[PDB]
Write an enzyme that holds these catalytic residues in place. Sequence first.
Site, PDB file in Angstrom:
ATOM      1  N   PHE A   1       2.709   9.941   2.695  1.00  0.00           N
ATOM      2  CA  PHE A   1       2.890  10.163   4.070  1.00  0.00           C
ATOM      3  C   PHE A   1       2.764   8.438   4.782  1.00  0.00           C
ATOM      4  O   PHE A   1       4.112   8.336   6.051  1.00  0.00           O
ATOM      5  CB  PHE A   1       1.890  10.314   5.293  1.00  0.00           C
ATOM      6  CG  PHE A   1       0.330   9.137   5.319  1.00  0.00           C
ATOM      7  CD1 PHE A   1       0.029   8.641   5.702  1.00  0.00           C
ATOM      8  CD2 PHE A   1      -0.424  10.154   4.543  1.00  0.00           C
ATOM      9  CE1 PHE A   1      -0.635   7.506   6.094  1.00  0.00           C
ATOM     10  CE2 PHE A   1      -2.086   8.926   4.581  1.00  0.00           C
ATOM     11  CZ  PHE A   1      -1.741   8.382   5.179  1.00  0.00           C
ATOM     12  N   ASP A   2       3.125   7.561   4.172  1.00  0.00           N
ATOM     13  CA  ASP A   2       2.837   6.198   4.310  1.00  0.00           C
ATOM     14  C   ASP A   2       3.095   5.248   3.367  1.00  0.00           C
ATOM     15  O   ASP A   2       2.228   5.454   2.525  1.00  0.00           O
ATOM     16  CB  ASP A   2       2.627   5.540   5.614  1.00  0.00           C
ATOM     17  CG  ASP A   2       3.026   4.195   6.517  1.00  0.00           C
ATOM     18  OD1 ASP A   2       4.017   3.687   6.525  1.00  0.00           O
ATOM     19  OD2 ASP A   2       1.425   3.514   6.477  1.00  0.00           O
TER      20      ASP A   2
ATOM     21  N   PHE B   1      -5.660   5.944  -0.094  1.00  0.00           N
ATOM     22  CA  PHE B   1      -4.790   4.906  -0.150  1.00  0.00           C
ATOM     23  C   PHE B   1      -4.578   4.177  -1.915  1.00  0.00           C
ATOM     24  O   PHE B   1      -5.525   3.200  -2.716  1.00  0.00           O
ATOM     25  CB  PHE B   1      -5.562   4.206   0.224  1.00  0.00           C
ATOM     26  CG  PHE B   1      -4.835   4.179   2.128  1.00  0.00           C
ATOM     27  CD1 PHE B   1      -5.939   4.824   2.432  1.00  0.00           C
ATOM     28  CD2 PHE B   1      -3.674   3.823   2.677  1.00  0.00           C
ATOM     29  CE1 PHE B   1      -4.761   5.292   3.553  1.00  0.00           C
ATOM     30  CE2 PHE B   1      -3.504   4.357   3.776  1.00  0.00           C
ATOM     31  CZ  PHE B   1      -4.177   5.854   5.006  1.00  0.00           C
TER      32      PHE B   1
ATOM     33  N   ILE C   1      -7.603   0.841  10.004  1.00  0.00           N
ATOM     34  CA  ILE C   1      -8.982   2.054   9.186  1.00  0.00           C
ATOM     35  C   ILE C   1     -10.435   1.227   9.184  1.00  0.00           C
ATOM     36  O   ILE C   1      -9.903   0.590   8.224  1.00  0.00           O
ATOM     37  CB  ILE C   1      -8.243   3.156   8.867  1.00  0.00           C
ATOM     38  CG1 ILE C   1      -7.468   2.990   7.743  1.00  0.00           C
ATOM     39  CG2 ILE C   1      -7.783   3.923   9.815  1.00  0.00           C
ATOM     40  CD1 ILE C   1      -7.692   3.622   6.615  1.00  0.00           C
TER      41      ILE C   1
ATOM     42  N   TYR D   1       1.099  -1.182  -0.039  1.00  0.00           N
ATOM     43  CA  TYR D   1      -0.440  -0.023  -0.233  1.00  0.00           C
ATOM     44  C   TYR D   1       0.657   1.216   0.353  1.00  0.00           C
ATOM     45  O   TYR D   1       1.931   1.261   0.145  1.00  0.00           O
ATOM     46  CB  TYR D   1      -0.540  -0.494   0.762  1.00  0.00           C
ATOM     47  CG  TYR D   1      -0.523   0.607   2.520  1.00  0.00           C
ATOM     48  CD1 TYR D   1       0.222   1.510   2.902  1.00  0.00           C
ATOM     49  CD2 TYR D   1       0.261  -1.172   3.883  1.00  0.00           C
ATOM     50  CE1 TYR D   1       0.380   1.973   4.357  1.00  0.00           C
ATOM     51  CE2 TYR D   1       0.658  -1.356   4.398  1.00  0.00           C
ATOM     52  CZ  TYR D   1       0.797   1.009   5.100  1.00  0.00           C
ATOM     53  OH  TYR D   1       2.058   0.632   6.560  1.00  0.00           O
TER      54      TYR D   1
ATOM     55  N   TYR E   1      -9.051   8.406  10.141  1.00  0.00           N
ATOM     56  CA  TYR E   1      -8.532   8.847  11.210  1.00  0.00           C
ATOM     57  C   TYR E   1      -9.079  10.293  11.725  1.00  0.00           C
ATOM     58  O   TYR E   1      -9.130  11.250  13.513  1.00  0.00           O
ATOM     59  CB  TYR E   1      -7.324   9.797  11.676  1.00  0.00           C
ATOM     60  CG  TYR E   1      -6.311   8.433  11.144  1.00  0.00           C
ATOM     61  CD1 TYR E   1      -5.695   8.087   9.469  1.00  0.00           C
ATOM     62  CD2 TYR E   1      -5.117   7.457  12.093  1.00  0.00           C
ATOM     63  CE1 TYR E   1      -4.980   7.166   8.749  1.00  0.00           C
ATOM     64  CE2 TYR E   1      -5.419   6.792  11.666  1.00  0.00           C
ATOM     65  CZ  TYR E   1      -4.459   6.376  10.217  1.00  0.00           C
ATOM     66  OH  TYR E   1      -4.275   5.101  10.371  1.00  0.00           O
TER      67      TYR E   1
END
Length: 108
Positions: A37-38, A100, A57, A27, A83
């Site tokens: 961010f990730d 994502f 999530i 991902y 979030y």
Amino acid sequence: MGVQVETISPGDGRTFPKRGQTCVVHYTGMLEDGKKFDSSRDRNKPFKFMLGKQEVIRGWEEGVAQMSVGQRAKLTISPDYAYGATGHPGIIPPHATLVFDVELLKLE
């Protein structure tokens, strides 16, 4: 809104995750403006979670369950499925819509 699933590349079209199965995914996570961010791809190690155990999530629980094995999909996730109002300090801002890029590699 909830989670929107948009296909990037098709899977087998037959094998969908059921509750209790472990999903192995690559991902990349981005803010709505496109800032990353990730990413499991940057770590070169896939990420595994068990569907239905709330280890991810809500948008992932509901979104990945709509994917077939081998599919790559773009998930757009509203903050309530993500979030929320709080976000995550210094990583995810308040009320953030997240995008994502997710590839479902296999089920264990």
